[PDB]
């Protein structure tokens, strides 16, 4: 699996003069290693980084298709924070050509019952119908800890391995040995040049889904660090 | 007043090449008359806009501000189809220097009920202490008749007349006659070349904020209906 990191800059920056900066600064990164890098964007500036960002990169849409599709973008987010409403829409989003990063994770109830694989898994059963055959290669999961996420709660290394396995092991239990080892299943807590060597060599996370660190100089390693994970 | 007609183009065109030849239609349609014209996108197509539309045309983003603004955009959508917290958005805008068109109206249930004048004042009641002063020289309101928009119910010239009266009557009731005198209220029904210049006609209807029409070339008709207010 080539390992993959998405840049969500979210609702940021504000002004399109300081995506463009940004999008400057991305454009002379020095990549090492073997990785696959996307980068979403609010809607205004998708032209923008459509048009200036490095072409061995991918624009991704925050969410959603014939519009974006008609600039050339080929990516978008789903589900980032109804389960059956959002595999629908990634079905179809499937069908119309797109590539997804589906996101899913539990809020800080289901992490504080005990319930966290049970709340993770059911999500990720409600997914596998939806997606089609033929698909699966259009397909990366990003797990995000809601419960982590403004709660003053922090996630470690090792919950983030144990969540990105409990999910390759119910694709292997639902949909086979073949499509669990093609998947790449992304980390989309807290991401940092501090952390992210040590989440890259788990062994169960592929990449990872950035934050604010998408928008600094340090997103390059974060990027760099794929020549950690066996 | 000057009469006024914003083009809603909602959830359309579906492709940005699509968005580029409507824009060329529209550069070379010939306006007669006195009216001040603005035309609200798709966010992924307001750079297209901003760019290649008439400048003496605006545009305007379909709801929300530093994003926009930083592509000189001055205009927005409100509210089209909670108050206070919709009130609060208008604060927040117009503090921030956007110029906005306010939406109001009602649904089926309370014009079926007899209580469609009571219900769009207690709108605007909101709304009102929510501008700042100096701030109404920077507001448009729109009454959009929801009870007669996907219903099979349909709004006759009368009920545009007598719910552009409703919104002036409040106005100058609750901030006085001057500011009443001075704010522009749209229709923000069904409008279309057939009957745009009986609408615009009416004493207190003062433009259009017109919906499928504003992606034809009859959209230019609506335009010029201005000659027909007094
Ligand atoms: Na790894
Ligand atoms: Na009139």
């Given at each position: 699996r080539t390992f993959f990191v998405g840049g969500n800059w979210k609702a940021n920056p504000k002004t399109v003069q300081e995506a463009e900066k940004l999008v400057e600064m991305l454009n002379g990164a020095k990549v090492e290693g073997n990785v696959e890098v996307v980068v979403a964007a609010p809607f205004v500036f998708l032209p923008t980084l459509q048009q200036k960002l490095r072409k061995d990169w991918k624009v991704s849409?925050?969410?959603?298709?014939?519009?974006?599709?008609?600039?050339?973008?080929?990516?978008?987010?789903?589900?980032?924070?109804?389960?059956?409403?959002?595999?629908?829409?990634?079905?179809?989003?499937?069908?119309?050509?797109?590539?997804?990063?589906?996101?899913?994770?539990?809020?800080?109830?289901?992490?504080?019952?005990?319930?966290?694989?049970?709340?993770?898994?059911?999500?990720?059963?409600?997914?596998?119908?939806?997606?089609?055959?033929?698909?699966?290669?259009?397909?990366?999961?990003?797990?995000?800890?809601?419960?982590?996420?403004?709660?003053?709660?922090?996630?470690?290394?090792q919950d983030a391995q144990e969540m990105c396995k409990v999910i390759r092991d119910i694709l292997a239990a639902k949909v086979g040995a073949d499509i669990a080892n093609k998947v790449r299943i992304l980390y989309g807590g807290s991401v940092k040049p501090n952390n992210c060597n040590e989440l890259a060599a788990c062994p169960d996370v592929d990449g990872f889904l950035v934050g604010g660190a998408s928008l600094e100089a340090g997103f390059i390693n974060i990027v760099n660090s794929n020549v950690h994970s066996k």
């Open positions: 849409a925050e969410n959603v298709v014939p519009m974006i599709k008609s600039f050339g973008i080929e990516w978008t987010i789903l589900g980032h924070s109804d389960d059956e409403f959002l595999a629908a829409k990634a079905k179809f989003a499937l069908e119309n050509g797109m590539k997804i990063i589906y996101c899913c994770g539990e809020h800080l109830s289901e992490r504080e019952a005990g319930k966290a694989s049970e709340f993770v898994s059911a999500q990720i059963e409600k997914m596998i119908p939806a997606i089609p055959a033929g698909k699966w290669d259009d397909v990366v999961i990003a797990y995000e800890p809601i419960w982590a996420i403004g709660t003053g709660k922090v996630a470690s290394t």
